[PDB]
Amino acid sequence: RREAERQAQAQLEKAKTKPVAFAVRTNVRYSAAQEDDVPVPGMAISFEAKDFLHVKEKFNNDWWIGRLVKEGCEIGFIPSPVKLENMRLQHEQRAK
């Protein structure tokens, strides 16, 4: 059940006070959709190519926790490289 969402939301709240572990500059875009199964719906971090993200910690194999380096942007779930690749694969399969 959606006890899972509650735990995910708790980990996110706990990370608000954690330091930035590392930063990345993106080479691709991510435009979040409901169907990406984000640990807490509504909390995915979308971004464009060449955006900067501050990453705090790993949530699971599909999702990190961090924020877009942009005024007013808050902590949420960032897709891992594994998750980005699986979305790219899924899209290329369905477009074929």
């Binding site: 590392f22 930063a23 990345v24 500059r25 080479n27 691709v28 924020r67 380096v69």
Partner: protein
């Protein structure tokens, strides 16, 4: 035929500020104008800033072992990159006084993702007079190469203001906005 991979690059947690222009580092006109700007940052961002000299050739940063063709070794450069990353780790503003960098293309293929600040004298005639009132050709050529860069994509900030105080306030405003983006509520 017709001339048409990791999703994330790891970069410093605060993008290092690098100054380029008006001409070549190592010569008086550029060294004095950049020194005034560094001086200003040290006191405007006191307690929030680290300004550090980098002498190693960080343009060199990215089965025969790759080695540098100059006095700056790839191992020394890697050590300096690591030091820059560490400086940025706690989210202080990092400013680099990077001797070897005079053109933004020099850092384009590195992992540093700098904030490139173009200190610009928009009129070449003005630059020529400044220099001669204090090697001319290499300086003019350098300033002209900067003037040829597509400005929006090459530079993060362009300081073309005649009055030092106006250039300083422009730089400060940009860095204050970056401070806010990164913190949710010559030397």
């Amino acid at each position: 035929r017709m001339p048409f991979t990791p999703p994330y690059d790891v970069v410093p947690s605060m993008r290092p500020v690098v100054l380029v222009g008006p001409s070549l580092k190592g010569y008086e006109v550029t060294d004095m104008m950049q020194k005034a700007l560094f001086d200003f940052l040290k006191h405007r961002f006191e307690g929030r800033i680290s300004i550090t000299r980098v002498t190693a050739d960080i343009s060199l940063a990215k089965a025969i072992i790759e080695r540098s063709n100059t006095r700056s070794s790839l191992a020394e450069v890697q050590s300096e990159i690591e030091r820059i990353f560490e400086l940025a780790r706690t989210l202080q503003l990092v400013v680099l006084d990077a001797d070897t960098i005079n053109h933004p293309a020099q850092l384009s293929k590195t992992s540093l993702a700098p904030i490139i600040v173009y200190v610009k004298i928009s009129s070449p005639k003005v630059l020529q007079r400044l220099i001669k009132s204090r090697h001319l050709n290499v300086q003019m050529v350098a300033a002209d190469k900067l003037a040829q860069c597509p400005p929006q994509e090459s530079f993060d900030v362009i300081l073309d203001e005649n009055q030092l105080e106006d250039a300083c306030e422009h730089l400060a405003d940009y860095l204050e906005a970056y401070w806010k983006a990164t913190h949710p509520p010559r030397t």
